[PDB]
């Protein structure tokens, strides 16, 4: 526990399933801690997690049990108290349903004391997309789709402009996830 700590930018967290959960900040560290733990006696006492993998794991569960849920992403700034961003506008759940959801999520994350559900404003999510693209003089057309919006970047983009556009998009999805606003580049000329 403190034992695992000494083994190693990480937070080691006790789980209700008697597992030890090592929270890492990114991919490189996740693989490193896995390499390290596998070489010794904790090799099956610990599991290394990070925000990208845990979002993927919870999204698969929700795909079946809450298949129409309008959500963004779960954030792990404090890994003992993950915060699940849901859409305020597109939420269809009563207060009691959201409480049930929080409890199921907590059961799915044995290292978490609680899972707070925060209702986020779609106007903010789309407004950060709009602002980021404008910040790069990227013309775009916003095109609504079923339960989403696509910002379609448009123009005869060169090498660097495409990379800058895609780097912005990746940074956008790290915050909001890719389930509401999505992006595309239409190449012209």
Author numbering: 172 to 179, 183 to 363
Show passages lifted from the paper.
The bacterial injectisome, or type III secretion system (T3SS), is a specialized syringe-shaped protein-export system utilized by many pathogenic Gram-negative bacteria for the injection of virulence proteins (effectors) into host cells. The injectisome can be divided into three major regions: the inner- (IM) and outer-membrane (OM) spanning basal body with associated export apparatus and ATPase components, an extracellular needle, and a terminating pore inserted into the host cell membrane called the translocon. In summary, we report the crystal structures for the cytoplasmic and periplasmic domains of PrgH and InvG, two of the main basal body components of the prototypical Salmonella SPI-1 injectisome.
No visible density was observed for these residues in the crystal form reported previously, nor in one of the two molecules in the asymmetric unit of the crystal form reported here, suggesting that these residues are flexible. We note that residues 370–392 were not resolved in any of the crystal forms obtained to date, and therefore these residues were not included in any of the modelling attempts. For the periplasmic PrgH170–392 domain, crystallographic symmetry-related molecules in the crystal produce a dimer that exploits the same general interface as the 24-mer biological assembly. Collectively, the crystallographic packing interfaces we observe support and mirror the low energy interfaces generated in our modelled basal body. This would be consistent with a model whereby the soluble domains have low-affinity interaction surfaces for oligomerization, which can be captured by the high concentration in the crystallization experiment. All the reported purified domains of the T3SS basal body are monomeric in solution, showing that the membrane-embedded domains and/or the presence of additional proteins are necessary for their oligomerization.
